[PDB]
Amino acid sequence: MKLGVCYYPEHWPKSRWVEDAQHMRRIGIQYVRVGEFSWSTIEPTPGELHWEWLDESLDILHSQGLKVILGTPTATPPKWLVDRHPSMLAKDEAGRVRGFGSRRHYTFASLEYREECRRMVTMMAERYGHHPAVASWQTDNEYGCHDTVLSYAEADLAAFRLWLAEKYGTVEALNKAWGNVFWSMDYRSFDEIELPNLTVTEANPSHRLDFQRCCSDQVVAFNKLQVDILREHSAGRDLVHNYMGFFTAFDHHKVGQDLDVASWDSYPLGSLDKEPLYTEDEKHTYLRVGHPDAGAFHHDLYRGCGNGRLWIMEQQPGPVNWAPHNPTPADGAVRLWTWEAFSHGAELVSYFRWRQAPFGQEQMHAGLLRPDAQEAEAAKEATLVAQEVKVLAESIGLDADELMSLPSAGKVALMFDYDACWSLDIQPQSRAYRYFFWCYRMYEAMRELGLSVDIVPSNAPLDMYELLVLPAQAHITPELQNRLNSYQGVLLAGPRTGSKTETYQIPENLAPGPLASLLPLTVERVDALPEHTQPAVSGRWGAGKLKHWHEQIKTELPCLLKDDGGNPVLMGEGRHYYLGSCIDNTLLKASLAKLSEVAGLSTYYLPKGVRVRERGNVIFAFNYSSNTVVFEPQNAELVIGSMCLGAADVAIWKKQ
Amino acid sequence: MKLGVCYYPEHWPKSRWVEDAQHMRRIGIQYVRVGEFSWSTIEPTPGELHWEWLDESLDILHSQGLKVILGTPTATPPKWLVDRHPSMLAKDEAGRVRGFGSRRHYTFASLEYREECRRMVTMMAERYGHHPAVASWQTDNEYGCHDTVLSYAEADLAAFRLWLAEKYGTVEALNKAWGNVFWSMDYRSFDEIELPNLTVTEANPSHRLDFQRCCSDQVVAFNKLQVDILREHSAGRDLVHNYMGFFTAFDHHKVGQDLDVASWDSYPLGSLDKEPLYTEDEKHTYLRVGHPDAGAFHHDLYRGCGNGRLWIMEQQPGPVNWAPHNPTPADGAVRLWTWEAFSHGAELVSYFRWRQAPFGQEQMHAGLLRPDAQEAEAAKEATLVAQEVKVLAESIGLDADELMSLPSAGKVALMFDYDACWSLDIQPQSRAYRYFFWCYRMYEAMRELGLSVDIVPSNAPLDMYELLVLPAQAHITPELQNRLNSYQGVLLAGPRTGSKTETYQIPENLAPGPLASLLPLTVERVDALPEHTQPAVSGRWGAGKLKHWHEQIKTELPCLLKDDGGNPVLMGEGRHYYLGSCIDNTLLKASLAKLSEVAGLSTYYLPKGVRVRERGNVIFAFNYSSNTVVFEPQNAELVIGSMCLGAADVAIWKKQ
Amino acid sequence: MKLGVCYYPEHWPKSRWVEDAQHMRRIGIQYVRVGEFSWSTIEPTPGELHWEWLDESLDILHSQGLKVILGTPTATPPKWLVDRHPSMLAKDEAGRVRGFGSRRHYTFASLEYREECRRMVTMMAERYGHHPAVASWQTDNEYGCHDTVLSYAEADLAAFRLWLAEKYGTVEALNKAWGNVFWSMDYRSFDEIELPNLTVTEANPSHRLDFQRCCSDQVVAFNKLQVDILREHSAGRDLVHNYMGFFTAFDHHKVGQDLDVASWDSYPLGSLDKEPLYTEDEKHTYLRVGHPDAGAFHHDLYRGCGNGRLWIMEQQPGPVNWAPHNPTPADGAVRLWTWEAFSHGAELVSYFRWRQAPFGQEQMHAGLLRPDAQEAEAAKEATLVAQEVKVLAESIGLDADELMSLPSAGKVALMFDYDACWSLDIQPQSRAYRYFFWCYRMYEAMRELGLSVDIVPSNAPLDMYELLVLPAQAHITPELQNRLNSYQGVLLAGPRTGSKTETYQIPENLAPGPLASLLPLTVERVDALPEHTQPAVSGRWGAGKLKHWHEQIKTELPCLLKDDGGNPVLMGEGRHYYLGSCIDNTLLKASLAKLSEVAGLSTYYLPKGVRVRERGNVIFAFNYSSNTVVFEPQNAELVIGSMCLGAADVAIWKKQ
Ligand SMILES: [Cl-]
Ligand SMILES: [Cl-]
Ligand SMILES: [Cl-]
Ligand SMILES: [Cl-]
Ligand SMILES: [Cl-]
Ligand SMILES: [Cl-]
């Protein structure tokens, strides 16, 4: 439970630097990120290097006891470098070059830019890898931001053809896997295969899925080259990357295998206003705090990506610049979001930025300070959180390190698979269906029942979970099916689970494919629905509606929910259940409450806008609504806040 | 009244083939289409040909008594061929190449691809043109699908400049016809003229119209080269093409002149969900059956294009893949659509496909069988229809061939002109006005009055029709005006009739141009309206509103409808009437009922969702609504179904 | 499971009588009611008696094997009798005489009319009490109809003053019990006490409650005088009265103590249209069948009043005359209502009337026949039910008598108390609160969960019930509290339970009064709410809203539901629970499902408009909706109807 800030000493005169560091310390900041956009300062023209600024900045930060997270500057290479390597530039889906003048102007497939990255990261790692200020390295900055994973340039095609040869061996094997007999798509060789953009009409879903996988693998490779250098020259330092909200274009679990920590960038007001996930009512109700699960969903996903280790590298401190509308946060919201992250096991919450810049694209993005260096609202809220974590630590008899080590895992797991996300986005089949939205709405229902949750990859060990939910595990690997067969907890498999092979085909036995041995049923066909037609649901466990996706199923399993035609909606017995339609929020909660009971877990329908999470003996309660509500856990005493939770407020209790 | 199926033996192991054909026979299928996407199977690399698969498949189908429709494979040429002929690829309106990886990757203007088509079609026609299994040939597959008529590549421009020289002779004549004095557009030569895309702002409507005409003519020429080969080498076989719903980019009457049969591809649930024609209420009400006139409109249009001969080459059997939302059809809907087609004179209704494919873009498109070869819903419904046509034939004392020969023509004609469609789409003048929508809504009103209808081209002989409606015959040829002058039935000319010359100019006498001698009036100007302003209408024949298009007219003709300012809306006497505003559904029915009475035809305001059509002494009744309704024709007896028409149900009566 | 009809031989020429009886037999009618409106036929002028018509009618009915229910004619005494006894006439609440010219023109307090009733009932009972046709007697006809229990004439006041002396002994005791120190209401003697109508403003609730009790007791006494005569002179005959839907002005349990059978008069379409209980949506949705619980609620209440024995004396057969709107029933609705009554244990369902009368107030009230003696819709539906009960009896190996003896009791009891109803109607305290409505809505929730229910009086033995619900048991007698203390099932006490003493005062310990020893809580005060303010509810068992009544409670009991202020809504543990607010339908079902689970009973959220009830091994299913829905009970086989329940349809299954 530590605080941090993102800082740009290169944006401010050196006469500010000592004061900045002292002020950071006064607030309770312990970690500071620098360097990720500094390449033009380091090397304004090739071979003429400027390290003095950074040498001095790191010493000043160290002298105040601040631990530094050093960013490699590869997100924003200089124009002289771009001009030397025209093949490094990405092309968008429309076939146009994505040029210099903003950030992230490269394709991950560019071998020329990778060699330039090897040079610069080696230079930096050799100079600073053993500097006593440097505790951690951030590779690059927000891989994929602005939809930069998929690129449609010559370099991307060259990498794709090599990647396909490695996967399939022969083009004959690829043609069989893709079903290229269809529409006479058959290739004579790998070098006949083109990019999947700018086709007359829909490209083969197998083609598009393998393309996504390849592009994701280029992110893995790009990151891995930096990691290898940093392991060699900066032993003992935590290697981290900063991931984003509402972003699925590369496999974050796979990138995470090469790193020590998963960090992410949380801007609850920007995501609420911008994202089509949210309803009009939600955008209005939660304008100044964000949706109650916007941070939570990602804290749990990225704790999984980090193999237990989660940071927030960038936390919203005030209004941002980049959403269509940019409201000021509610008073107390920065405190709210900070404690929120700590309740999900975040080691560190780092704000961004330290001081609002008066120039450039983000001149309207707030910081802890205003552009004139006077304190803004987040400075006082951060100060309060730092005081409150000391109060908490003392109340439960722990030091800072023991506090951070409190357990964070939930006993309910939601399985999120990037490969499934890509498959389902490629052919949603109803335009109202989105894998991410469905996962998020299943998660919201869990959270409205007061459950503490882990979000896990498909290769995760399952033995520590009493309830396991697979919202839409489109392809089930033979190894996952083995883990499911031996799993001793309660399983809910959601619609479209086991509906696709590895190469984007329908399984020979139809959906749910490998799962059918565990859960004997057959999806005969799919009724894929618009928003305006929502069939009625009834049965043993509740009544309500279904929307978007409506599987027509034959089974002998007992039915817990059915439609008016008597067709199975939710079916199962003992410890195994299958859901074939996207049931509404009411029915999601009804079903999860029943399943939780089978699994030996308690549930509680929390008040609207209220959320709870546990870390060992500590209970964290949050109120995202605009009015005071009472939350009183049983057999516990108040440590921070009150039983009457204010609007945008936090209370912390300890079990007796 | 025969059944068919679209089949892909190349998608299934040869061990399935005998069983497939036997199963088809058991259902009552008599015709089978194969081959239109098989070029990569036939010729995977140039000069290495594989006919054995098709040789064997045709023999197996023949041995079960199935008649084969053989498709030329030119819709989907292989990648090796594309790579050899880069000039064959189309460009979209934005100037980007439309690449390989889907289907229909060629421009019709490509002379290089036409020679490759000449080669392959000659090869196929020589091998199979006298095979006893082959009853018919389909040229290509869905000309124009995915907006592939208009293309903006070098080959298209080259063809356009030649086409313009042929039409005009001199560039001086073209400049006069287009009015190129306007905005200094004058060309010194044909080779100065560019494509009409990527201009600063709106291109000359004359330029855009001649471009559409030229592109349409390239479809005619592309098809004609295949027809000439097939006439030579496959005498006696029916030559057919498969047209689409809601598609107007080429002249289907003109392509039809070179063929024996017009077939089309009916997907009522896809078109309902996808097409902006339909209201929100219609999309909801008819979700699982399609709009009551969606098939009907096209059955009548394409019966005209086929000079009496209509097939449905592709009939929806279950949920499809390609619309934004893809619901399952109502139980009985496949039967409904099949009888519907038969009521409009369809010789053959062919489903698609036989077995749902587990791979490729359309893996979620249903068939008569599921991907595991078990029967899906359409198999049972098709079986029932086959039994019901035998019952019908026996009840009226006819054999199968006599049944098919029952008369199909209506005594009401609606004139549809592709050239008018292009003109009116080029400058709709109110964005709420669409030629196709207006034609469809005039047709809907006729159908709600129980009328059996022909849709006819502008060169059709008129003597067999008692009532003739020209919804918006923008240009009237001198030859059409002569036919109108001598026509002895009742004429209704709709708004914008006779408003344009051949070369996109206003006639010298103003609208309605050549029609003014028959119907003396002057359109002084047009009030072109948004949806929110719908002026009131009253008069001799009814009251209601007008929308979208509101002509200000001077006439001495008697007025049957007028606006509140007393301006003529519907005017005429004896057997000739002009309508100057787009009157609402109520007023359309009021007016058509009056006009029908003058023409000696009866009308009946059918219940909501109910439709009727006659073939000689047979009455076909349909219920597209969700509830039971009573339909009882006078002086007739029930043959199939009931007087209480169920939801998505059919009844068939014979006159006494 | 027998059929009956209400018949008026005195309305038809004697030439019809033999035919009427034969026709009744053909339909399957076994019981016939006659005589209850015949006093002017029997005695048109005093002392001149005409029995010949009835002597002959009973013989004709007997000769066809029809069993007769003979009605005493005291509901409609003749004008000559009224003119002789002006003190017999009631006065309404406004002080006006309620005159001759309709029916029910007497006050139950009139001693003069009671002596006239003694005379006539003795005359009838002596003549017909041993007639072999007479199986049963109905006393009077619909006691209380047209709000005739409360009357405000001199006779009512005289009876009230005597009744008060009997209850209290001294006026001093009455003044103490009523709290007449308040507003100087103290009486010096019983003869100072007036009727509670026409006061300046609100009368003492103690005064109004004792007045209701007294008036109810006059109904008991009026009925008891007839019962005593009929016991003496017609031994072995079933004595019955015909009660009504939605009528609470006398104690039906107390009247029932003196009778053998409780019968009632069910007009589902009239009650739906007329009663303010029902919402606008319900009135529209169920127009032609009635609300799904309209009959059910009363079948269960009156089975309790009949100590197990329930008849329907009058069943709607077609449109009635008396509601503001009078629709025709849905086709099959009469069958629906008949089977409905049988599923609740009705021995007999009797229609009304046999033939629609062409004269008088009810000339538009349908019968089994039209006024011209041709069959109407109910004749065919009744015939079908008679055939179906024979099919049922044979399928389960029972004779008619064994069929009738099938068990009927539910394992869930809802306690209905007329005294509580009067108390709560006297001061509802929120105008949106009504005891009857609350009981009905608790019952609806039980029924939507598929539960079979008993409705019981407060003195009922409780040992046969696993779940017991007291919706609002305002006063708890010491004897009821003893029964609750020893009850071994699950108890839910609803809001306002134990809130009043016997004499309309707040208990000394506050609400819930005697229940507080069992359920320790204190109602500190009441928030009595309009419809527009419905506080949010959350907690262990669900989320939703409360309306109308919102008790502010202090308790140490665990809370299963709470409001946003953390105030208890539903509280308890083990087998005892208290509900303090009128929670919505969703929360009622959530709570009843939990309570049912504690009690060892299963629940099922049935489809909308569907209801189920059991009698031993027989399962009765009903569909009150307008569309087909699937109901399939487990471990059972179909006997009558189908798994696909049609609109207004019935299916009957037997357990395997
Ligand atoms: Cl900064
Ligand atoms: Cl991307
Ligand atoms: Cl096929
Ligand atoms: Cl096009
Ligand atoms: Cl009668
Ligand atoms: Cl009353």
CATH number of the CATH domain containing B495: 3.40.50.880
Distance, in angstroms, between C603 CA and closest chain A CA?
7
Tokens 């951070």, located at residue = A404
Instruction: Measure the CA–CA gap between C525 and C527, rounded to whole angstroms.
Output: 7
Q: State which H helix or E strand residue B402 sits in.
A: helix B400-404
Question: CB–CB of C630 and A564 under 8 A?
Answer: yes
The helix-helix angle for C171-178 and C154-168 (nearest 10°) equals 90
∠ CA(B72), CA(B78), CA(B80), 5° rounding?
140
Tokens standing for residue C42 = 């029997």
Instruction: Measure the CA–CA gap between A563 and C643, rounded to whole angstroms.
Output: 14
Please check whether residues C336 and C323 belong to one and the same domain: yes
Question: CB–CB of A566 and C539 under 8 A?
Answer: no
Tokens standing for residue C112 = 């003069």
Please check whether residues C446 and C367 belong to one and the same domain: no
Please state the length of chain A.
656
Contact criterion met (CB below 8 Å) for A190 and A174:
yes
Contact criterion met (CB below 8 Å) for B16 and B23:
no
Q: Tell me the helices (H) and strands (E) count for chain A, helix number first.
A: 19, 25
Q: Is the dihedral of CA C209, C211, C212, C214 positive or negative?
A: positive
Amino acid identity, position B398: L
Instruction: Measure the CA–CA gap between B582 and B588, rounded to whole angstroms.
Output: 9
Instruction: Render the burial of A378-417: b for 16+ CB within 10 Å, e for the rest.
Output: bbebbbbbbebbeebbeebebeeeebbebebbbbbbbbbb
Please check whether residues C281 and C246 belong to one and the same domain: yes
The torsion of the CA quartet C632, C637, C642, C648, rounded to 10 degrees, works out to -70
Tokens 């005593």, located at residue = C228
- Residue B407, preceding bond cis, omega within 30 degrees? no
Instruction: Measure the CA–CA gap between C426 and C150, rounded to whole angstroms.
Output: 13
From the list B168, B153, B147, B158, the residue with the least C-alpha distance to B210 is B168
Q: What is the CATH number of the domain that holds B612?
A: 2.60.40.1180
Instruction: Measure the CA–CA gap between B553 and B569, rounded to whole angstroms.
Output: 8
Instruction: Measure the CA–CA gap between B438 and B248, rounded to whole angstroms.
Output: 14
What Cα–Cα distance (Å) separates residue A511 from each residue in B255, B372, B454, C12?
44, 11, 46, 71
- Residue B512, preceding bond cis, omega within 30 degrees? yes
End-of-domain residue from the set A606, A623, A645: A606
Amino acid identity, position B360: G
∠ CA(A111), CA(A112), CA(A118), 5° rounding?
85
Q: State which H helix or E strand residue B386 sits in.
A: helix B377-395
Partners of residue B528 on adjacent β-strands: B549
A391 part of contact set with chain C, CB < 8 Å: no
Tokens standing for residue A621 = 């309660």
Please check whether residues A289 and A425 belong to one and the same domain: no
SS3 content of chain A, % helix, strand, coil (to 5): 35, 20, 45
Cβ-Cβ contacts under 8 Å for C490 (sequence gap 6 or more): C466, C467, C468, C575, C576, C577, C595, C598, C599
Question: CB–CB of C542 and A605 under 8 A?
Answer: yes
Backbone angles phi, psi at C72, to 5 degrees: -70, 140
Cβ-Cβ contacts under 8 Å for A125 (sequence gap 6 or more): A137, A229, A230, A232, A233, A234
Backbone angles phi, psi at B376, to 5 degrees: -105, 180
**Could you write out the DSSP letters of every residue in A531-549?**
TT---EEEBTT--EEEEEE
* Strands (DSSP E) found in C390-431: 412-415
**Could you write out the DSSP letters of every residue in B529-569?**
--TT---EEESTT--EEEEEEEEEEEE-SPEEEEETT--EE
Contact criterion met (CB below 8 Å) for A421 and A216:
no
Question: CB–CB of B321 and A187 under 8 A?
Answer: no
Tokens standing for residue B413 = 């004609």
**Local structure of residue C91 (DSSP, 8 states):** B
Terminal-to-terminal C-alpha distance of chain C: 22
Residue B32 Rama label (left phi>0; alpha psi -120 to 50; beta):
beta
Please check whether residues C318 and C343 belong to one and the same domain: yes
Cβ-Cβ contacts under 8 Å for C115 (sequence gap 6 or more): none
From the list C419, C397, C393, the residue with the least C-alpha distance to C496 is C419
A617 part of contact set with chain B, CB < 8 Å: no
Please check whether residues C281 and C384 belong to one and the same domain: yes
Tokens standing for residue A400 = 């800072």
Please check whether residues B45 and B19 belong to one and the same domain: yes
Instruction: Measure the CA–CA gap between B150 and B218, rounded to whole angstroms.
Output: 10
- Radius of gyration (Cα) for chain A, nearest Å? 25
Instruction: Measure the CA–CA gap between C294 and C300, rounded to whole angstroms.
Output: 11
Distance, in angstroms, between A481 CA and closest chain B CA?
21
**Could you write out the DSSP letters of every residue in B58-115?**
HHHHHHTT-EEEEEP-TTS--HHHHHH-GGG--B-TTS-B-BSSSS--S-TT-HHHHH
Tokens standing for residue A502 = 């590895």
Q: State which H helix or E strand residue A526 sits in.
A: strand A521-528
Q: How far is CA B32 from the centre of its chain?
A: 22
Amino acid identity, position A180: N
End-of-domain residue from the set C407, C430, C445: C407
**Could you write out the DSSP letters of every residue in A365-409?**
---SB-TTS-B-HHHHHHHHHHHHHHHHHHHTT--HHHHHTS---
Instruction: Measure the CA–CA gap between C579 and B603, rounded to whole angstroms.
Output: 65
Instruction: Measure the CA–CA gap between A571 and A412, rounded to whole angstroms.
Output: 20
A428 part of contact set with chain B, CB < 8 Å: no
Please check whether residues A377 and A452 belong to one and the same domain: no
A536 part of contact set with chain C, CB < 8 Å: yes
Instruction: Render the burial of C434-450: b for 16+ CB within 10 Å, e for the rest.
Output: bbbbbbbbbbbbbbbbb
Instruction: Measure the CA–CA gap between C609 and C648, rounded to whole angstroms.
Output: 9
* Strands (DSSP E) found in B140-256: 238-244
Ligand nearest to the CA of C317: 5
From the list A108, A103, A127, A35, the residue with the least C-alpha distance to A72 is A35
Per CB-CB distance under 8 Å, the chain A contacts of B79 are 185-188, 192
* Strands (DSSP E) found in A380-506: 412-415, 453-456, 467-470, 490-493
Per CB-CB distance under 8 Å, the chain A contacts of B372 are 508-510
Q: How far is CA C48 from the centre of its chain?
A: 38
Per CB-CB distance under 8 Å, the chain C contacts of A647 are none
Burial of A499 (0-12, 13-18, 19+ CB in 10 A): buried
β-pairing, B618-623 with B649-655? antiparallel
Count Cβ atoms below 10 Å from residue A359 Cβ, excluding itself: 8
Tokens standing for residue B125 = 């026609």
Instruction: Measure the CA–CA gap between B631 and B608, rounded to whole angstroms.
Output: 11
Instruction: Measure the CA–CA gap between C115 and B292, rounded to whole angstroms.
Output: 74
Question: CB–CB of C629 and A564 under 8 A?
Answer: yes
Please check whether residues A577 and A629 belong to one and the same domain: no
**Local structure of residue B45 (DSSP, 8 states):** B
* Preferred mutation among A605, A608, A626, A638 to probe C, highest tally of C CBs within 10 A: A605
Instruction: Measure the CA–CA gap between B160 and B214, rounded to whole angstroms.
Output: 6
Q: Chains meeting C at 3+ CB pairs closer than 8 A?
A: A
Burial of A65 (0-12, 13-18, 19+ CB in 10 A): exposed
Count Cβ atoms below 10 Å from residue B164 Cβ, excluding itself: 22
Tokens 């209400």, located at residue = C6
End-of-domain residue from the set A355, A379, A407: A407
Contact criterion met (CB below 8 Å) for B237 and B136:
yes
- The resolution, in angstroms to one decimal, equals 1.9
Please check whether residues C456 and C347 belong to one and the same domain: no
Contact criterion met (CB below 8 Å) for C29 and C4:
yes
Question: CB–CB of A605 and C562 under 8 A?
Answer: no
Q: State which H helix or E strand residue A560 sits in.
A: strand A559-563
The torsion of the CA quartet B589, B591, B594, B599, rounded to 10 degrees, works out to -100
Instruction: Measure the CA–CA gap between A553 and A406, rounded to whole angstroms.
Output: 45
Instruction: Measure the CA–CA gap between B186 and B56, rounded to whole angstroms.
Output: 61
Q: State which H helix or E strand residue A554 sits in.
A: strand A544-555
Catalytic pick among B116, B314, B347, B444: B314
Distance, in angstroms, between A491 CA and closest chain C CA?
23
Partners of residue C262 on adjacent β-strands: C241, C310
Give the domain extent around B634: 607-656
Report the half-sphere exposure of C300 (CA within 13 A, side-chain side). 26
Number of domains composing chain B: 3
Contact criterion met (CB below 8 Å) for A618 and A396:
yes
Tokens 């939605």, located at residue = C246
Distance, in angstroms, between B231 CA and closest chain A CA?
26
Burial of B433 (0-12, 13-18, 19+ CB in 10 A): buried
Grouping H, G, I as helix, E, B as strand and the rest as coil, residue C121 is helix
Instruction: Measure the CA–CA gap between B570 and B559, rounded to whole angstroms.
Output: 6
Residue A449 Rama label (left phi>0; alpha psi -120 to 50; beta):
alpha
Please check whether residues C575 and C611 belong to one and the same domain: no
* C115-122 long-range contacts, CB within 8 A, separation 24+: C116/C77, C116/C81, C116/C85, C117/C72, C117/C74, C117/C222, C117/C225, C117/C226, C118/C225, C118/C229, C120/C39, C120/C42, C120/C43, C120/C72, C120/C73, C120/C74, C121/C72, C121/C74, C121/C225, C121/C226, C121/C229, C121/C230, C122/C229, C122/C233
Instruction: Measure the CA–CA gap between C449 and C471, rounded to whole angstroms.
Output: 17
Please check whether residues A457 and A477 belong to one and the same domain: yes
Q: Is the dihedral of CA A505, A509, A511, A515 positive or negative?
A: negative
* Strands (DSSP E) found in C307-408: 310-315, 348-352
Cβ-Cβ contacts under 8 Å for A149 (sequence gap 6 or more): A108, A143, A215, A216, A219, A249, A250
Instruction: Measure the CA–CA gap between C6 and C237, rounded to whole angstroms.
Output: 18
β-pairing, C467-470 with C453-456? unpaired
Q: Tell me the helices (H) and strands (E) count for chain B, helix number first.
A: 19, 25
C597 part of contact set with chain A, CB < 8 Å: no
